[PDB]
């Protein structure tokens, strides 16, 4: 009955919110136990329940972001958090298309005078 992220992948949002609430109720009881003289087993359960709480929130956040990215896939403007991070300097670079652009004067020069392959006899 341990919580594993794989088991949680396909579930609905409200189903995970319910599962989250049960763990949060459980942790609060354990925190009451921590000060009323609960056995070592209950104390050790705190860390197990805390990471179970993290796992559920992780799967909720991940699932929500996955669908937001699908939502904004075809959109021109996306939320700043859905745009590539990279580094600040790399985000300000000329993009792929802009770097490939050449003036018509340079395109004609390359067509008429392409660098050739040759050899010189020894």
């Amino acid at each position: 009955a341990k919580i594993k992220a794989r088991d949680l992948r396909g579930k609905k949002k409200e189903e995970l919110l319910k599962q989250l609430d049960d763990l949060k109720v459980e942790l609060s009881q354990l925190r009451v136990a921590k000060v009323t003289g609960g056995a070592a087993s209950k104390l050790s359960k705190i860390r197990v329940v805390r990471k179970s709480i993290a796992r559920v929130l992780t799967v909720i956040n991940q699932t929500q972001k996955e669908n937001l990215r699908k939502f904004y896939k075809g959109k021109k403007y996306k939320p700043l958090d859905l745009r590539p991070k990279k580094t600040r300097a790399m985000r300000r670079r000329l993009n792929k298309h802009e770097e490939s652009l050449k003036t018509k004067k340079q395109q004609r020069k390359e067509r008429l005078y392409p660098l050739r392959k040759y050899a010189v006899k020894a």
Partner: protein
């Protein structure tokens, strides 16, 4: 048409409300101070027991950021009781202690047994 005042003032011009093409944040941030966050654990000292028995008061350690209204609403939802008032102090070690008094139709001594304090 005419100016009855020698002063010239900037005329009022239309100011449109924002209509973003995209939201800067994809999703709202989750509430990190929900009810389970506000109430950390109950205090079980000798003076806390006196509060329960004599003053119909529960003693909780709560998040320092929480206010009285938040504590009152969290206590009611978590344990399904009614609260008369809340007194709060911040302890010398930084924790916030809440002196929660229950309505006269509630017995803090009974409620403590439900919570597990007693």
């Amino acid at each position: 048409k005419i100016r009855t005042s020698p002063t010239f003032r900037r005329p009022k011009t239309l100011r449109l409300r924002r209509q973003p093409k995209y939201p800067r944040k994809s999703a709202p941030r989750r509430n990190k101070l929900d009810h389970y966050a506000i109430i950390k654990f109950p205090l079980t000292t000798e003076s806390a027991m006196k509060k329960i028995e004599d003053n119909n008061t529960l003693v909780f350690i709560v998040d320092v950021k929480a206010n009285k209204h938040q504590i009152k609403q969290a206590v009611k939802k978590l344990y399904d009781i009614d609260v008369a008032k809340v007194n709060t102090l911040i302890r010398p070690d930084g924790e916030k202690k809440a002196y929660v008094r229950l309505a006269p139709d509630y017995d803090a001594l009974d409620v403590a047994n439900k919570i597990g304090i007693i």
